[PDB]
RNA sequence: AGUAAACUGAGAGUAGAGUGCUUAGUUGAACAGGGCCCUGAAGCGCGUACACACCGCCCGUCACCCUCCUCAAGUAUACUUCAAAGG
RNA sequence: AAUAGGUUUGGUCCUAGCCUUUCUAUUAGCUCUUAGUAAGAUUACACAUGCAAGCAUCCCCGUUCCAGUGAGUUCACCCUCUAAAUCACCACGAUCAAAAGGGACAAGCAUCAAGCACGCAGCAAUGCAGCUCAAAACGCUUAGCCUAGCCACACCCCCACGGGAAACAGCAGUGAUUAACCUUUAGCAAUAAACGAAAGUUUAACUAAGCUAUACUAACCCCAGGGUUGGUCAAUUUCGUGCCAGCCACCGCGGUCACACGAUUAACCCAAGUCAAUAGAAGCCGGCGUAAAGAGUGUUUUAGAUCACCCCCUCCCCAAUAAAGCUAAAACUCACCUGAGUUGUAAAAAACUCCAGUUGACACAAAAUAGACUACGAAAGUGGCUUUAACAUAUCUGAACACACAAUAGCUAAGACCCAAACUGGGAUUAGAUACCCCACUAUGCUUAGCCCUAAACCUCAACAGUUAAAUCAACAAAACUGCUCGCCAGAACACUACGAGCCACAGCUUAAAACUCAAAGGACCUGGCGGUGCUUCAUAUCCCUCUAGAGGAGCCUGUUCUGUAAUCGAUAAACCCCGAUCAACCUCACCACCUCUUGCUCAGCCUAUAUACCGCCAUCUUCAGCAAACCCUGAUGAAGGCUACAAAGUAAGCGCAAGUACCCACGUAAAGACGUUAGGUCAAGGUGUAGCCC
């Protein structure tokens, strides 16, 4: 079997970046309440505190993940790099908004 | 060659040395993509634990994991050094045990 | 082994054995010699053995050679004033040509000794600096003077770490 | 001497000649495209000359010839 | 060559058990001359990519897998150059 | 690369790459006591905050310096001329140093070979058409440099009016980023700088401190760790694991007795370090018949050489080349007369019978003998006859930047056509036969005119001059070298490839890399084996043709394999198969089921594993005659080899053969039959090493 195997469509890889460490732990505890792994799997590639960085874009491009920013900013250089690499930066400011958007991406992965 | 030819050719020009898998660097940071085993070339037989990792430069490469037993997984961070695996054709990188997410081998 | 006949000619030791150092007037030396003929033998050996030494001691003097252009070999020197010195070399050995041109256009042993001494004034022994330029780098190398702290720690009283501590 | 080095070259040349025969129609389409770009690259080289000299058009009566066509 | 062929007896071993084995004897042949074609031996060579040795070695086509490279339609992006000029 | 070492093979020699040992730096792992000193972001990415230039009776002066960085990159050095500045003021000069002029000045790529105005003259007008370049122009890429220091840059647009935009490459600090990560200390006391007439003032320059094993020096009553221990290369005990887990710089290790893995013990090296990765340091005077390499051929320029001069012995002639003409032998075709067959080969078929044989007529094809000659030509090539024209150079080397040539095959056009002949068709063969064999026939070979530009174009041995002197000389081949020049070569493979460029070439040619991969490839040998290998002589129940009786078919007897059974084992090509067994109804017995015993017939036992640990006893070549100690000699003292009797380097104890002995001879048959080969048979004759079992 091919040493490198194809990630299935129903797999959401997410990068979580937050303004403060306590905010990140809150989002990570919400990602630990995921119970629908059968229909779709949620993978946490990397989590950290601070603005979106090139490593986050490189990690998202490596695993075809989605960067979720919580009360953080992404500069034009980082945003332009994401366009070339196809990464989706999803900056939010409210935790119920960032979870609703997280559920919308999971729904898309689900089978029709 | 004649003295006239040696003068005309000049001093011998060394080729620029070939950068190995680390691109002339002692170590590189990498992210583990997948783990697997690769069989050694004849006459050796074994299941040598290897992994594919994207380096900080953006080049995916196969890296050998030394020691008895490892727990590397996808998305993890590892530091890779040079040193080819003699019996694994094409394996020119080695994971450093005890750095980042790759821990030291557990004794016995 | 070194390629060619008389490879000694291609050594720094041989090239430094030239005794002909031209006066500043000498700007160009043309050598007209013949490849064959018993009377042009010294000029051929002069070109073969000594032209390399002359050029080595006189790097800024143009030396140009001309083969079989005239019936006899001769040297001609062009001076900065515009004067030309014709030296007939037919029948003369290579050693006689070198001794001839040394007498009429070479610096004497006295003029060379002086130049060497003026060069010694450039490296004064009492000066301190890098080994490339000076004998000693620091006065600490002189016996009797306070040595470098890298080798002999200075007394606590001569160190600012403790001068301020007591004062403060 | 043995002919083992000759034999290595023999097989390489055999396989190469056979490959070319198998792909002679693709290679012909590729070669044509390269000659077109080669002609365009040549025309650009000449246009650079008159444009860098201050002229706005090619010298009067000048037509850049096709120097790469089989004709 | 007292060979083959045919015939007869005995022994070993068993409590008994062989169309087997070991062994003694009787009768008693045919061919043995050509050949180097076939398969080998010896002598003297030749060749050799074989050397646990021809049951040796070995080339190419046709998968999976892994590594690198090239060509390439259309398209996009980035970089480079301009004034080193003219009115 | 050195005082070198390891690694190609069955072995030797040569060549060759790779690696080892030495010395630094960075980074990682693990570990770390003190003092002194030195050094100290990965990044020209973005920067919070604080500070870093003031001085001074107002003017000026300074903030154009110091400090920083290494993006770009021959503005750095020498000469000429000559501003600004210092010597209060002119110095009628020195010192220092711009601009300008001249010269010099990095690396890689020539697959960057042409640049495209790059020159000159003239007072001007204007005229001429030149200028640089294979001795590397132009171009692309890389990099701060020649370190008392210098150059360049100062957020970007080379510049900085203007614009983008709001600037730490000043100190401290921070985000991002990288394998890489110093304190948001103090003082102007010293030195340096700025300012002042000066006392003085200011200065993140600098000084004295802070942090950090990166280095050096020194020390310590207590306090040592890292790596290594198969060879290279200093140094391992007991266990575990069993080609697994793992290790490895190189060669390699591990598949049930691991000095190589893991643990443990001990030892070795270095030591507050250790040494895993990475990087640098250490590489042109060697070669080119066969290892990479004399570019298919000859001829220049600028140059280089001393082989030029004197001074010379084979000029000339044999198969150079071009053109025109010519034909002896053999074919083809046709005609007459005969024949019924011809052709084909190990043997056939198919094919042809307008076929075959005799005779005559008879070519745009090809050139027996000579040639045992060795000539001509630059090479490629050139060997039938005649004629014509005709075979460069009164020094040598020399063009892959040019010119002219270049077997065969091939392309285009027009002709010839005997024979041969890719392809193709048929016949045969074969498991198949897209081959080898047979037949037919085309492209093509020929002429003319253009192309194409390739050969194992190799005598794989460059041109010219010279030597046989020696230190002859790795091996082989075709002895070893000297001078000089040009060409070419630098592990294997990728690769007579890709890309670029050129070309009447278009499935082409020439030039010609890289990435990934390997630790070899390679050249020449030694010995043996093997050969559908040569010659010679043979086989003596024997290789063939022969001779006699059998087996293979039938039934039975017996062994084996398969199948079957709850129900052994071993042998199992020659060299198993009425074999271990000169022997199984119980027993034998080792198997199967059930039941029973546990210090047991034994100071226990085991027919448990391993014949690939062995002794013992044997098979096999052997229906052989060779093995081997100790010496000697040869090969330049390599693996290896060692015979000539009119003898030339072999001498050889011992073992086997032989000789003897047994049986009825001196014959025959037995017996004997070495060293080795098949890890051949046998742990189930017995014994026994190692591992396993002990209710
Ligand atoms: S060098 Fe002289 S005091 Fe340090
Ligand atoms: K092995
Ligand atoms: K070597
Ligand atoms: K002032
Ligand atoms: K730089
Ligand atoms: K700039
Ligand atoms: K001060
Ligand atoms: K070792
Ligand atoms: K060739
Ligand atoms: K003839
Ligand atoms: K040849
Ligand atoms: K042999
Ligand atoms: K039978
Ligand atoms: K045995
Ligand atoms: K036994
Ligand atoms: K045993
Ligand atoms: Mg290693
Ligand atoms: Mg041969
Ligand atoms: Mg090949
Ligand atoms: Mg075979
Ligand atoms: Mg070899
Ligand atoms: Mg400075
Ligand atoms: Mg840089
Ligand atoms: Mg002045
Ligand atoms: Mg200047
Ligand atoms: Mg190219
Ligand atoms: Mg740079
Ligand atoms: Mg900046
Ligand atoms: Mg600027
Ligand atoms: Mg700073
Ligand atoms: Mg930081
Ligand atoms: Mg550091
Ligand atoms: Mg003052
Ligand atoms: Mg201060
Ligand atoms: Mg300090
Ligand atoms: Mg360390
Ligand atoms: Mg063990
Ligand atoms: Mg071990
Ligand atoms: Mg060769
Ligand atoms: Mg030649
Ligand atoms: Mg027939
Ligand atoms: Mg010539
Ligand atoms: Mg040539
Ligand atoms: Mg030709
Ligand atoms: Mg032709
Ligand atoms: Mg025919
Ligand atoms: Mg056929
Ligand atoms: Mg024809
Ligand atoms: Mg003809
Ligand atoms: Mg030839
Ligand atoms: Mg050649
Ligand atoms: Mg030549
Ligand atoms: Mg070819
Ligand atoms: Mg080609
Ligand atoms: Mg091409
Ligand atoms: Mg028989
Ligand atoms: Mg039967
Ligand atoms: Mg049986
Ligand atoms: Mg068996
Ligand atoms: Mg057996
Ligand atoms: Mg019983
Ligand atoms: Mg029984
Ligand atoms: Mg038993
Ligand atoms: Mg055995
Ligand atoms: Mg006898
Ligand atoms: Mg016998
Ligand atoms: Mg005997
Ligand atoms: Mg066996």
Tags for this entry?
part of a larger assembly, 4 chains, B: 108 residues, mainly beta, 5-stranded mixed beta barrel, 5 strands, C: 168 residues, 4-stranded mixed β-sheet, 15% strand, binds FE2/S2 (inorganic) cluster, binds magnesium ion, RNA-binding, Small ribosomal subunit protein mS25 (chain C), structural constituent of ribosome (chain C)
Your description of this structure?
This is part of a larger assembly, with chains A (112 residues), B (108 residues), C (168 residues) and D (71 residues). Chain A has helices spanning 21-31, 54-63, 76-85, 95-109; strands at 11-18, 41-49, 66-70, 88-92. Chain A is α/β, with parallel strands linked by helices. In chain A, strands 2-1-3-4 form a 4-stranded parallel β-sheet, with helices on both faces. The relative contact order of chain A is 0.21. The longest helix of chain B is centred in the N-terminal third of the chain and has 7 residues, at 3-9. Chain C has 168 residues and is of the alpha+beta class. Chain C has one domain (1-164). In chain C, α2 (41-57) packs across α3 (94-105). Chain D has 2 helices and no strands. Classes of the chains: A alpha/beta (112), B mainly beta (108), C alpha+beta (168), D mainly alpha (71). The A-B interface holds A 3-5, 43-46, 58-59, 62-63 and B 31, 33-34, 36, 38, 52, 54, 58, 62, 74-75. Bound molecules: FE2/S2 (inorganic) cluster, potassium ion (K) (15 copies) and magnesium ion (52 copies). Residues 43-44 of chain B line the site of one potassium ion (K). One potassium ion binds at residues 43-44 of chain B. The structure holds 2 RNA strands.
Number of strands of chain C: 4
Beta-strand share of residues of chain C: 5-15%
Class by SSE composition of chain D: mainly alpha
Gyration radius from CA atoms of chain C, angstroms: 28 Å
Q: Any idea what the shape of chain C is?
A: elongated
How many structural domains can be distinguished in the coordinates of chain C?
1
* Strand/helix succession of chain C: HEHEEEHHH
Derived from helix and strand composition plus strand pairing, the structural class of chain C reads alpha+beta
- List how many beta strands of chain D DSSP finds: 0
The helix count of chain C comes to 5
Question: Could you estimate the helical fraction of the residues of chain C in percent?
Answer: 25-40%
Number of helices of chain D: 2
Oligomer: part of a larger assembly
Instruction: Give the topology string of chain D: H per helix, E per strand.
Output: HH
Number of domains of chain D: 1
Spatial order of the strands forming the largest sheet of chain C: 2-1-3-4
Taken from the alpha-carbon principal axes, the silhouette of chain D is elongated
Distance between the termini of chain C: 75 Å
Unique bound compounds: FE2/S2 (inorganic) cluster, potassium ion, magnesium ion
**Beta-strand residue percentage of chain D:** under 5%
PDB class: ribosome
Keywords: Initiation factor 3, translation, ribosome
Entry title: Initiation complex of human mitochondrial ribosome small subunit with IF2, fMet-tRNAMet and mRNA
Chain A: Translation initiation factor IF-2, mitochondrial
